[PDB]
Each structure stands twice: as structure tokens, then as C-alpha cells.
Amino acid sequence: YEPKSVKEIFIEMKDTVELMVDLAYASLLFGDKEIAEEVLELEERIDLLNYQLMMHSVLAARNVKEAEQVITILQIANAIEDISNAAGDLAKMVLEGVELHPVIKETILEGEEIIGKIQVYPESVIVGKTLGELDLATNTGVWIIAVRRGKRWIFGPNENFKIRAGDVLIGRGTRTSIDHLKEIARGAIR
Amino acid sequence: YEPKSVKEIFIEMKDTVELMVDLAYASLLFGDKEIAEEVLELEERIDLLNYQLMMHSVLAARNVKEAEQVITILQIANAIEDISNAAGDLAKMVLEGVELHPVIKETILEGEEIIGKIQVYPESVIVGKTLGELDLATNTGVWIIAVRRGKRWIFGPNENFKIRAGDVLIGRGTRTSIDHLKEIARGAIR
Numbered sequence: 280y281e282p283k284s285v286k287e288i289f290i291e292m293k294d295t296v297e298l299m300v301d302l303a304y305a306s307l308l309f310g311d312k313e314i315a316e317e318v319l320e321l322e323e324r325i326d327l328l329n330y331q332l333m334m335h336s337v338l339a340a341r342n343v344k345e346a347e348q349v350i351t352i353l354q355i356a357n358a359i360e361d362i363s364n365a366a367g368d369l370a371k372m373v374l375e376g377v378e379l380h381p382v383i384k385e386t387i388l389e390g391e392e393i394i395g396k397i398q399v400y401p402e403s404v405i406v407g408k409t410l411g412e413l414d415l416a417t418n419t420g421v422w423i424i425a426v427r428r429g430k431r432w433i434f435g436p437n438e439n440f441k442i443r444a445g446d447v448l449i450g451r452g453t454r455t456s457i458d459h460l461k462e463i464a465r466g467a468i469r
Numbered sequence: 470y471e472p473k474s475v476k477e478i479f480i481e482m483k484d485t486v487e488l489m490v491d492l493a494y495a496s497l498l499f500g501d502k503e504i505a506e507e508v509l510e511l512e513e514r515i516d517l518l519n520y521q522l523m524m525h526s527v528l529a530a531r532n533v534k535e536a537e538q539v540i541t542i543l544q545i546a547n548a549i550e551d552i553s554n555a556a557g558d559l560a561k562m563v564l565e566g567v568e569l570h571p572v573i574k575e576t577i578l579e580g581e582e583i584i585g586k587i588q589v590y591p592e593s594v595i596v597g598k599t600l601g602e603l604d605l606a607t608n609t610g611v612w613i614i615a616v617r618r619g620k621r622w623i624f625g626p627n628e629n630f631k632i633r634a635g636d637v638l639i640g641r642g643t644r645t646s647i648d649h650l651k652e653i654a655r656g657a658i659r
């Protein structure tokens with residue numbers, strides 16, 4: 280097997296917790312238990328990555344200097360793991376199925392950065408293009424955290440994900456950044 | 470005095486913790502103690518907002534139904550407050566001045582979303598424009614979390630913030646989203 284680097288593990292942890300928090304808010308906004316389940320699965324991945332980070336750090340360091348440095352990484356991962364647990368706490372509320380105060384969904388839809396649901400029509404120019412080819416985060420500011428395609432979810436889609444008419448994109452971004460993408464998705468803006 | 474709504478307090482909490490985490494990573498990337506100090510000040514604001522949220526929730530609810538609903542809000546704020554404490558943990562490492570493992574700065578610069586430093590030249594078209602007039606988050610995907618102007622910091626600048634040549638923008642976004650803004654900032658792209 281090809282060994283992983285500390286940086287690769289660390290980057291995945293950071294990237295994953297960010298996605299986790301976004302998905303946690305999405306689960307609350309949509310009262311969606313499947314999204315909530317995904318958050319919990321990611322919390323487990325975070326525990327696994329944290330374990331590997333500790334293993335790598337323990338094995339890599341043999342003297343005091345090296346030790347002091349790997350400890351800084353473990354300390355940061357520790358804080359990251361706390362954020363993952365908080366996202367999991369939010370997800371659990373959705374799985375418990377509690378009736379949320381109406382202000383909650385409004386809050387997620389009206390803050391600086393919001394979560395939006397975008398319907399893709401056949402006439403849109405993004406149909407048939409991949410997220411990478413598109414680089415939506417780069418070119419629209421809207422970051423796609425998930426896609427609902429029929430009876431299935433694609434969480435954290437990669438650059439190879441090709442968009443189809445009928446897809447429902449779950450994006451994170453500013454309000455005007457979400458409405459802009461909706462225009463493009465409706466084919467209004469070519 | 471004009472009373473605040475639960476939603477206003479809640480939105481500020483959510484917005485603030487997001488900014489806190491971004492600033493925490495910025496403090497680590499730049500080994501900047503002033504940014505770290507700002508994170509700690511925001512952790513205190515979060516404690517204050519949490520207090521006001523509890524006050525509003527306690528006063529607003531008088532019967533079981535209303536109580537069950539305000540509790541959902543308090544439960545979410547509880548998780549948000551945990552995230553704020555994690556950001557504060559990261560900031561403290563910078564204030565302690567520990568020597569960070571080199572992988573840390575690399576990780577912040579190479580993940581899905583990174584933190585970038587952008588120099589604004591006199592010839593750039595963004596000079597003299599406000600963040601609102603510009604709506605950078607909306608129009609570039611790059612979210613401006615802070616600006617270093619001479620010997621002073623402006624954290625979480627509002628829509629009225631007018632950009633000047635010599636400003637150093639601290640942005641959050643994708644790599645290609647950061648390089649794009651740098652082009653605009655250098656005047657290369659009008």
C-alpha cells in the first residue's frame with residue numbers, strides 16, 4: 280500500500296468538517312434525515328482520520344524538536360474534531376425529528392452565507408458539464424455541497440460529477456450568489 | 470431601546486462563528502497574534518449573544534408548546550458555541566507563539582477552500598469601490614474576512630467598506646478563485 284502523508288490526512292479532515300457543518304445546516308433547513316445520516320457517517324470518518332493523524336505523528340517524531348512540531352498538528356486536529364462533534368449534534372436533532380422553531384430555517388436562508396436548493400432545467404448551459412469543467416466554486420462563488428438526483432444523494436461531489444437536467448443542487452453561498460446560479464440553472468442566463 | 474429579535478441574535482451568532490473559524494485559520498497561516506486576539510474577542514461576543522438568546526427564549530415561551538420550540542434554538546446555539554470555543558482554541562496556539570509544523574500553513578493554502586492575501590494596486594478597478602457596490606462574495610466567490618490597511622486591521626468589513634490601493638485583502642475561497650481576484654487586484658483584469 281502507498282503511505283498517506285500527514286498533510287493529506289490533515290487536509291481531508293479540514294475539508295470534511297467544513298462539508299459536515301454545511302450539510303448539518305442543510306439537514307436542518309430541509310428537515311432531511313438522510314443528509315443528517317451523512318453528517319454522522321462523516322463524523323466517523325473524522326474519528327478515523329484523527330486516529331491516522333495520531334499514528335503518523337507518533338511514528339514520525341523521535342526527538343524533542345520533531346515531537347513539539349507534530350504536537351501542534353494534533354492540537355489543531357483536536358479542535359477540528361470538536362467542530363465535527365458539534366455538526367453531529369445538529370444532525371442528531373434532525374434524526375430525533377424534533378419540530379424546529381421557524382426562525383431556524385429562516386436563519387439558514389437569511390445569513391451572510393446561505394444554503395440554497397437549485398433546480399437544473401434541460402435548457403441550462405451547465406447540463407452535461409462536470410463540476411471541474413465548471414469549477415462552480417471558482418466561477419460562481421456557489422459551492423456545491425450535495426446533489427439530489429432522483430431517489431439518490433451525492434454528497435460532496437467531486438470534479439468529475441457531470442450535471443444532468445432534473446438534478447437538484449444544494450449550494451452554499453451568498454443570497455445573490457444563489458439566485459445568480461438559479462438563473463443559469465433555469466437557462467435564463469447562457 | 471429597540472428590542473432585538475431571536476432571529477437577529479441567532480443570525481449574528483452563526484455569521485460570527487463562521488468568521489471566527491476563518492480568522493482562526495488566518496491567524497495560523499500568518500502567525501498573526503492580532504488576528505488571534507480578534508478571534509478571542511469574538512468568542513466573548515458569542516458568549517454575550519448566547520446569553521441574549523437564552524434571555525429571549527426564556528421570556529418568549531410561557532407554555533409547553535412554545536417552550537419545546539425555543540429549546541430547539543438553544544440546542545443549536547449550544548453547538549454553535551462549541552464551534553466558537555474550538556476557533557478560540559486555535560487562536561490561543563498563535564498567542565502562545567508555538568512553532569507550527571510546516572504542514573499547517575501548507576494545509577490552509579492547499580485545501581478545497583483556502584485563505585489568501587491579496588495586494589491591491591492603484592490601477593485596479595476595485596479601488597474606490599465598496600464591498601457592497603462590489604459584492605465580491607457574490608461576484609467573485611472570494612469572501613473578504615479582513616483587510617490590513619497600514620498599521621490597522623478591519624475585521625469582517627461591512628458593505629460600506631471602500632477599498633484603497635495598498636490594502637491587503639484577506640480572502641477565503643478556492644485557489645483559482647483567489648488567483649482570479651489577485652489578477653483583478655493587480656489591474657491585469659479590468
Ligand SMILES: [Ca+2]
Binds near residue numbers: 322325326360364
Ligand atoms: Ca469524534
Ligand SMILES: [Ca+2]
Binds near residue numbers: 336
Ligand atoms: Ca515516535
Ligand SMILES: [Ca+2]
Binds near residue numbers: 357361
Ligand atoms: Ca474536546
Ligand SMILES: [Ca+2]
Binds near residue numbers: 430431432
Ligand atoms: Ca434513496
Ligand SMILES: [Ca+2]
Binds near residue numbers: 447
Ligand atoms: Ca430531480
Ligand SMILES: [Ca+2]
Binds near residue numbers: 512515516550554
Ligand atoms: Ca463560550
Ligand SMILES: [Ca+2]
Binds near residue numbers: 529
Ligand atoms: Ca417563560
Ligand SMILES: [Ca+2]
Binds near residue numbers: 547551
Ligand atoms: Ca459544550
Ligand SMILES: [Ca+2]
Binds near residue numbers: 620621622
Ligand atoms: Ca496597529
Ligand SMILES: [Ca+2]
Binds near residue numbers: 617618619635636637
Ligand atoms: Ca498596505
Ligand SMILES: [Cl-]
Binds near residue numbers: 286287
Ligand atoms: Cl502531500
Ligand SMILES: [Cl-]
Binds near residue numbers: 407443444
Ligand atoms: Cl441531462
Ligand SMILES: [Cl-]
Binds near residue numbers: 474476477
Ligand atoms: Cl428579524
Ligand SMILES: [Cl-]
Binds near residue numbers: 596597632633634
Ligand atoms: Cl486609493
